[PDB]
């Protein structure tokens, strides 16, 4: 299909790749009589591993010749051809994960800025003031636009330069 790939469920080497692991695993657990937890621990992993195979085959990942599932970047490809969960969705997740801690770091420096000596306030955090920021940081996309358009996000031209 896409890019000369095939869905991993209808792949073949992928099916080798799944059923070659259990063999090497089970031939190993034949050395432990069931009265041993190692007989159970190995068993539980073989059943744990097969779950993910039926998951990867189902979810529709694309395995190339090797049988290993690949991904696809472009929105116009992921979206239209149906699998965007590889990056396109989690690339939104991350930004909200990263910007949240990103923007929660900016407010704290603002709130702790005006004082007698902000320095000791950076070493020793007052967690309540940091908590009020961790709370306030949520919905940073809407709070970033506003510091952006109100003009309070940038520090403008009093920055220092050299020559």
Partner 1 sequence: QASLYTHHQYIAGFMLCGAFAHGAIFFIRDYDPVANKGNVLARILDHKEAIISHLSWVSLFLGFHTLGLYVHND
Partner 2 sequence: GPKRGSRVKILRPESYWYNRAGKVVSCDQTGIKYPVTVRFEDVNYAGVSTNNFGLQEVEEL
Partner 3 sequence: KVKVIVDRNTTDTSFEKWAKPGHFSRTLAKGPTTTTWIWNLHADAHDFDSHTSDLEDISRKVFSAHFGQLGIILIWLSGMYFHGARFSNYEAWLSDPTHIKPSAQVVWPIVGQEILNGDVGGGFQGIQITSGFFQLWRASGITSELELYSTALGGLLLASAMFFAGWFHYHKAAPKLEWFQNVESMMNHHLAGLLGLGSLGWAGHQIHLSIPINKLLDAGVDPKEIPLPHEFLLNRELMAGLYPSFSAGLKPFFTLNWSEYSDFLTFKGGLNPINGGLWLTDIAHHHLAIAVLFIIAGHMYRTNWGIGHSMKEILESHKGPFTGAGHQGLYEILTNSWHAQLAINLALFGSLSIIVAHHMYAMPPYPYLATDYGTQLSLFTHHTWIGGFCIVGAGAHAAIFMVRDYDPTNNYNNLLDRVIRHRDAIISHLNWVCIFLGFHSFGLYIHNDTMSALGRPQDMFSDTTIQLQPIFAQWIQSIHYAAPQLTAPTASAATSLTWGGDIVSVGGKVAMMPISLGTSDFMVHHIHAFTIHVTALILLKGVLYSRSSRLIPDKANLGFRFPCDGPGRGGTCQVSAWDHVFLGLFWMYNSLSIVIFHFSWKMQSDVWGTVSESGVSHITGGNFANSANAINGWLRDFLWAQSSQVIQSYGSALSAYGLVFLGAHFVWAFSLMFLFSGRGYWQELIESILWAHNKLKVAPAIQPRALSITQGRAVGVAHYIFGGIVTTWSFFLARIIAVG
* Beta-strand runs (E) in 24-151: 62-63
Mention every residue, 6+ apart, whose C-beta is less than 8 A from residue 40.
34
For 55, 75, 84, 99, the CA distances from 89, given in Å and listed in that order, are 18, 10, 6, 16
* Binding pattern for the stretch 102-141 against partner 2, x by CB under 8 A and - elsewhere: ----------------------------------------
Comparing CB distances to partner 3, the nearer of 106 and 132 is 106
Say if residues 78 and 61 touch (Cβ distance below 8 Å).
no
Question: Closest separation between CB of residue 118 and partner 3, Å?
Answer: 4
Q: Return the residue of 75, 82, 90, 105 that touches partner 3, per CB under 8 A.
A: 105
Say if residues 33 and 39 touch (Cβ distance below 8 Å).
yes
Comparing CB distances to partner 3, the nearer of 18 and 84 is 18
Question: Closest separation between CB of residue 57 and partner 1, Å?
Answer: 21
Question: Closest separation between CB of residue 33 and ligand CLA, Å?
Answer: 30
| Whole-angstrom distance, CA of residue 80 vs CA of residue 141 | 26
Q: How many Cα neighbours within 13 Å face the side chain of 141? A: 6
* Binding pattern for the stretch 52-91 against partner 2, x by CB under 8 A and - elsewhere: ----------------------------------------
Q: Return the residue of 24, 119, 150, 161 that touches partner 1, per CB under 8 A.
A: 161
């Amino acid at each position: 299909d896409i890019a000369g790939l095939t869905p991993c469920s209808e792949s073949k080497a992928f099916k080798r790749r799944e059923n070659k692991e259990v063999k090497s695993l089970q031939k190993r657990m034949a050395k432990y009589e069931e009265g041993s937890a190692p007989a159970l621990a190995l068993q539980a992993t073989a059943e744990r591993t097969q779950k993910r195979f039926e998951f990867y085959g189902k979810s529709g990942l694309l395995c190339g010749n090797d049988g290993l599932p690949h991904l696809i970047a472009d929105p116009g490809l992921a979206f239209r051809y149906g699998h965007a969960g590889d990056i396109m969705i989690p690339t939104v997740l991350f930004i909200y994960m990263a910007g949240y801690t990103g923007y929660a770091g900016r407010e704290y420096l603002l709130a702790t800025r005006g004082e007698k000596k902000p320095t000791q306030k950076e070493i020793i955090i007052d967690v309540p003031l940091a908590l009020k920021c961790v709370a306030g940081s949520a919905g940073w996309p809407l709070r970033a636009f506003n510091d952006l358009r109100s003009g309070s996000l940038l520090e403008k031209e009093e920055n220092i330069t050299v020559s």
